[model samples]
Target chain A: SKVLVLKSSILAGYSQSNQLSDYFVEQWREKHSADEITVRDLAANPIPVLDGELVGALLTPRQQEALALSDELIAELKAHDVIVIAAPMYNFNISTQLKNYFDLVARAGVTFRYTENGPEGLVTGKKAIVITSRGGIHKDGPTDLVTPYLSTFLGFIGITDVKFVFAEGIAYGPEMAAKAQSDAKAAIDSIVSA
Target chain B: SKVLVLKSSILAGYSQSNQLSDYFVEQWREKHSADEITVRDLAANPIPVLDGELVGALLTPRQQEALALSDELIAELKAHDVIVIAAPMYNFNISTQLKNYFDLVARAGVTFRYTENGPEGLVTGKKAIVITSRGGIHKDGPTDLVTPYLSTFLGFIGITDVKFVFAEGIAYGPEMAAKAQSDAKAAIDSIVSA
Candidate 1:
């Protein structure tokens, strides 16, 4: 099965001492078969910001140019039987980089289409794993903002069966950070094996 | 009373080609006294991304250094009986720039705090006018993502009474854009007058 891994964290590695991105990569390597891995480092090669031309492309019937970009994005998405998104909760939501990526792939009459029966996602038969790190513990609590937003955004694009591995309370202290990281790692392991 | 106008258009000056922001600002100016208006151009002077230091400052006691920034933000919020926010929807939600500003200003034990009853807002006795522009129509429809997200975020920080004016279908064509703009202007006029 094909797998696509997205690194949304700007940090270089993952650990209490290391960066979150590195930890995520290491976890993916451990979880996946060595041959079936593709990585999209958004920070290094940023997606183009949606401009007038791109918006114009969306409205026109001459969608080949737009589909060139969308096809590439969709191909990667479709090739992957499983998608692992290492999304660090930036500013209480997803990163601008990741959002821009979504703008490209979430095309009308392509990834999704409007029907009399309501909207339907063309891309299906895939599972998603979302690994997120938040400074504060906001999941299932009074203050949690990341989960709901993440769940909603992903669900909008048609990925419903998502498993979330969250490293919460990282900003609370070293002990909390360590515990959260460990818990997240354990969660990742369980999902991978399952 | 002094009034602060926070404009969140990514571009400066609404062209006749792009008059959504100009329309909102004009309506706001006409409704309020001339001596009251003070503008914060977020695009010109972008708010800093919330980092570890900023987060630490928020959670600490005696945040004297951070208080200067908070006071400046709070003063702007307090100065206006009604805050006119010219916020055009960027993605499916608010712009990162505006979200960053919210992160800086909406602090715990400052902008709001948890009570035995629930979370209570410290900033009170003010109203917000949210002027938004969308590529497609989403306001009244089941697919309207902006209204719910914006309302929820603003409500989370204790701004319960928010009036939204959406310039929908602006990205479709010149005719639709003009119509949407006119409708938004009419809505703004009615809101300001009321």
Candidate 2:
């Protein structure tokens, strides 16, 4: 399987070394070393926020000259079969880097097309495993905005088999954090081993 | 009221014909002549996506000197008593520009700080009226990612008195767009009149 490991956490390379998503990725790698894996560090290689110039470029008559970098990103996304994302909640949402990356990839008539029913996503049959870490407790809760947002966006882009791994309440102290981490690891083992 | 009108829609100046959020702002101004209004165009003056460079600057001992423009943005936010955001839902979420602006403002120990209980927001005594325009019918729905994301983010920075007005299902047709506009107009009337 072609696997794309997408990292969008600020804590990825900092003193906050215990990245929740890394544990899952490592476990998956340990299980399946034969699978081709590619990592896209969105924090390091930031995608520009959507602007008129970019949109205007996209809607140009030729429409083939949007941005070489952005075109490369779309091609990279299309090449992946399974995408693993490490998302840390910032201000109760996904990082701006991740959002910016999504904006670049969600090109009209390319990733998705407008239909009589509604907008139809073109990228299909890809499985996504999203690992999200948050300081407060809102995993799959009413206030948890990360999962729904990702699911809807990915679904809009035609990738529907999206799963979530949660490491929540990290700020609650050692015991709670330990429990959440253990639960997340077990969840990963269940998915990867299966 | 000191109103900070933050515009993230790409259609603000381009298609003066179908400017979605302008009606509410105009009505607001027509009614409240005494209110001081400030508009922040995220598209024209883009804020960089939150990266290590941006984060490093924010964590500096003297965060005031983080980025000259970013400092001005934060100062504008701090000066406002009422914030009216004209947010256009992009790919079931918000425009990357809006998210980027939030990234700049949501600073640690500045806009919010860690407390014994949890993260507490510092930007207080402010009311936020968020006017969102969407193509489909997902106003506060299971698939709607915009409002909850905004609500939680704004709440994180202590702007809890946030109200939302939705202009939804505009892509259906002119009839639907007109109805949505009229509906949004009524919703705004209630808020501003109250």
> Per-candidate TM vs. native?
0.69, 0.88
Candidate 1 has what TM-score?
0.69
Cα lDDT computed for each candidate against the true fold: 0.67, 0.78
Q: Candidate 1 docking category?
A: incorrect
CAPRI class assigned to model 2: medium
Give DockQ: model 1.
0.18
Candidate 1 ranges beyond 4 A from true positions: A14-34, A57-71, A141-145, B1-21, B36-81, B87-91, B96-126, B133-161, B165-190
Q: Which ten residues in a row have the lowest lDDT in candidate 2 chain B?
A: B12-21
What DockQ, between 0 and 1, does each candidate earn? 0.18, 0.70
Q: Let me know the TM-score candidate 2 reaches against the reference structure.
A: 0.88
Residues B74-149 of candidate 2 have per-residue lDDT tens digits of 7889999988888788777788778878888988888888887878999999999888888789964788878888
